Design a protein around this ligand. Structure first.
Ligand code: HEM
Length: 291
């Protein structure tokens, strides 16, 4: 299966900037969600989970088809809690019904990273909604109880290398684990709705203890009130991942640039962009627009 990007009829940069702005303004307005974390982190995770079902071997799953709108995928246990991001985007989709579901879900992630002061993420339009029978089965999203070998093997299915994996994982600065959603509890740091390299600094600098949470699952905890999943912690157990963690801990700009590339790639996996497609768009933030 080849998924060819097809621009929403007649639409151009300014149309999508309006969509970006509506998501950004809602993000500002609906500030109370998740004990005042706001929707930014769950939107980044929604973009990732809608993309991360991709299999490079047969081009199944991925962001193109916007299949999270179908029950099989919205009810994936791995997706618990993402319904809050979907609900957030519903009025956006009502206002701008011309946008495809995959374009909305990926653009939600981009908007969220940028509004939270993260890097600019170039984004391309043209995802097309595909039918319910194209929904990928549950179980393509990764488990958190596993080791570095698991992580490395897992992400080969998404055509990601060590650098790309370590860079992507830095999104775990954002948000938190919720015991009832995933069996893990706690934030990864202090700045959990601002996009920084804190995930890496915390890995290296905090004094981590291996504990059991109230779900009887092991996680790494610090006295500052932070946590890491076992798959997070695996990035400092494995000597290849560790070198990269150290690099991002010591160079904010490099983390930003590599994250931006890896996240755009994640979001575009599976999609064939024709040769005369528009160039990727770089959206202005609300701050840059004086809005
Ligand atoms: C080994 C790969 C990964 C595993 C096992 C994993 C696992 C998890 C788990 C268990 C949670 C907690 C969910 C909850 O209880 O609410 C979570 C949260 C999150 N993950 Fe991942 N994750 C991975 C990779 C990524 C990547 C690649 C991204 C994006 C680039 C990402 C973004 C997020 C975000 C933003 C949250 C916070 C969501 C919220 O606060 O509602 N994760 N992850």
């Amino acid at each position: 299966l080849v998924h060819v990007a097809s621009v929403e009829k007649g639409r151009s940069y300014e149309d999508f900037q309006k969509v970006y702005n509506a998501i950004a303004l809602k993000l500002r307005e609906d500030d109370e969600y998740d004990n005042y974390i706001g929707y930014g982190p769950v939107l980044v995770r929604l973009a990732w989970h809608t993309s991360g079902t991709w299999d490079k071997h047969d081009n199944t799953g991925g962001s193109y088809g916007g299949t999270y709108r179908f029950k099989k995928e919205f009810n994936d246990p791995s997706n618990a809690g993402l319904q809050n991001g979907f609900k957030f985007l519903e009025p956006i989709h009502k206002e701008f019904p011309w946008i495809s579901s995959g374009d909305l879900f990926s653009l939600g992630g981009v908007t969220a990273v940028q509004e939270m002061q993260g890097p600019k993420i170039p984004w391309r339009c043209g995802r097309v909604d595909t039918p319910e029978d194209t929904t990928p089965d549950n179980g393509r999203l990764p488990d958190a109880d596993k080791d570095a070998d698991y992580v490395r093997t897992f992400f080969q299915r998404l055509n990601m290398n060590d650098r790309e994996v370590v860079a992507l994982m830095g999104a775990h600065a954002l948000g938190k684990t919720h015991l009832k959603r995933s069996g893990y509890e706690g934030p990864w740091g202090a700045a959990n709705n601002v996009f920084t390299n804190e995930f890496y600094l915390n890995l290296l600098n905090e004094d981590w203890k291996l504990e059991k949470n109230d779900a009887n699952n092991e996680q790494w905890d610090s006295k500052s009130g932070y946590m890491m999943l076992p798959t997070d912690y695996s990035l400092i157990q494995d000597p290849k991942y560790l070198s990269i963690v150290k690099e991002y801990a010591n160079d904010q700009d490099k983390f930003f640039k590599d994250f931006s590339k890896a996240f755009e790639k994640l979001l575009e996996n599976g999609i064939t962009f024709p040769k005369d497609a528009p160039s990727p768009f770089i959206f202005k933030t609300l701050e840059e627009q004086g809005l």
